[PDB]
C-alpha cells in the first residue's frame, strides 16, 4: 500500500505475513483455527510449476500477530490453481486466540454486488516501493465487473480478447472473480498485498466476512481496478479439504 491509514489498533487479527525463501513478503489470511487461505500464485514464488507441495512447504516462513512465528505442516493447492488462484496452509499447532490473533469466518451470503465497500489489509510495498515496515490497510469500493473486464482486456466476447493490460502481465478474469474499484483518494494495493482478504463488515449482524482474496496485486498506481477471487465460490471446496 502506497498511501495511508496506518494500522493503529490491530483491527485485522486474521492477517498473516508469510515471507518466501528470497525475502519476498506476502499476505495470507487465517481462515480458521488450524488453517489459513492464500493464493496459488503466492505459494509458487521462487518455485517451478513442477514443484509439488512437499517441496514448497519447508521453504516458506510465516508470521502472525506481531512477530509471532507459527509453524506449518502441509500445503494444499487448488485443483484449478492456474485458474482459481488459491492455496491452503495448515499450521502445525493451534494459535492462541486473543485480541490481536484470531481467524476470520467464511461467508454464507454472497456480497459481490456493486455499491458495497470492503476493507483490504496489507503488508505490501508503498510509494517508495519499499516493503512496508508496519502493516497497513485501506478501504475500497466494489467495481462494475464489465467495466473491469473491458478495462484489463478488450473484449467481452472471447475472440476479441487482446492484452490491453497497463502492466506487462495479464490478470485472471473469469466467473469466479470480482473487481474492486479504485479508492476515493486513488489509493491502491501493490506488491506483497496478494493473499490478503477483502473483508466486508456487515453492520446489521456486525460481522466481518472475507468475500474475496486479492489475486492481482500488480495494479498499484497504474491500473484502475484491483481484482479478487470470490471466496464463496471455493466455499464447497475448502470444506471438503478441511476434513483432511
Amino acid at each position: 500500500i502506497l498511501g495511508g491509514h496506518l494500522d493503529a489498533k490491530g483491527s485485522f487479527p486474521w492477517q498473516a505475513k508469510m515471507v518466501s525463501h528470497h525475502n519476498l513478503t506476502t499476505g495470507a489470511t487465517l481462515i480458521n483455527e488450524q488453517w489459513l487461505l492464500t493464493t496459488a500464485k503466492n505459494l509458487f514464488l521462487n518455485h517451478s510449476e513442477n514443484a509439488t507441495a512437499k517441496d514448497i512447504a519447508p521453504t516458506l516462513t510465516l508470521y502472525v500477530g506481531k512477530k509471532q512465528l507459527v509453524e506449518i505442516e502441509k500445503v494444499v493447492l487448488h485443483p484449478n490453481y492456474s485458474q482459481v488462484d488459491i492455496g491452503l496452509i495448515k499450521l502445525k499447532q493451534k494459535v492462541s486466540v486473543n485480541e490481536r490473533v484470531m481467524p476470520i469466518c467464511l461467508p454464507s451470503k454472497d456480497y459481490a454486488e456493486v455499491g458495497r465497500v470492503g476493507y483490504v489489509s496489507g503488508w505490501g510495498r508503498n510509494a517508495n516501493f519499499k516493503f512496508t515496515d508496519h502493516l497497513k490497510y485501506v478501504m475500497l469500493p466494489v467495481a462494475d465487473q464489465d467495466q473491469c473486464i473491458r478495462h484489463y482486456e478488450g473484449s467481452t466476447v472471447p475472440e476479441k480478447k487482446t492484452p490491453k493490460s497497463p502492466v506487462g502481465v495479464q490478470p485472471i478474469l473469469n466467473e469466479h472473480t470480482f473487481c474492486a474499484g479504485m479508492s476515493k483518494y486513488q489509493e491502491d494495493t501493490c506488491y506483497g498485498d496478494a493473499g490478503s482478504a477483502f473483508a466486508v463488515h456487515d453492520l446489521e449482524e456486525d460481522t466481518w466476512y472475507a468475500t474475496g482474496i486479492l489475486s492481482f496485486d500488480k495494479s498499484c498506481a497504474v491500473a484502475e481496478y484491483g481484482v479478487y477471487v470470490k471466496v464463496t465460490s471455493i466455499q464447497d471446496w475448502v470444506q471438503k479439504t478441511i476434513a483432511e
Binding site: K9, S11, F12, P13, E99, R100, C105, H201, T207, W208
Partner: peptide, 10 residues
Amino acid sequence: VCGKPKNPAN
C-alpha cells in the same frame, strides 16, 4: 465466532 475484534476499525 464472527464479528468481534477487541478493538475494531471505527
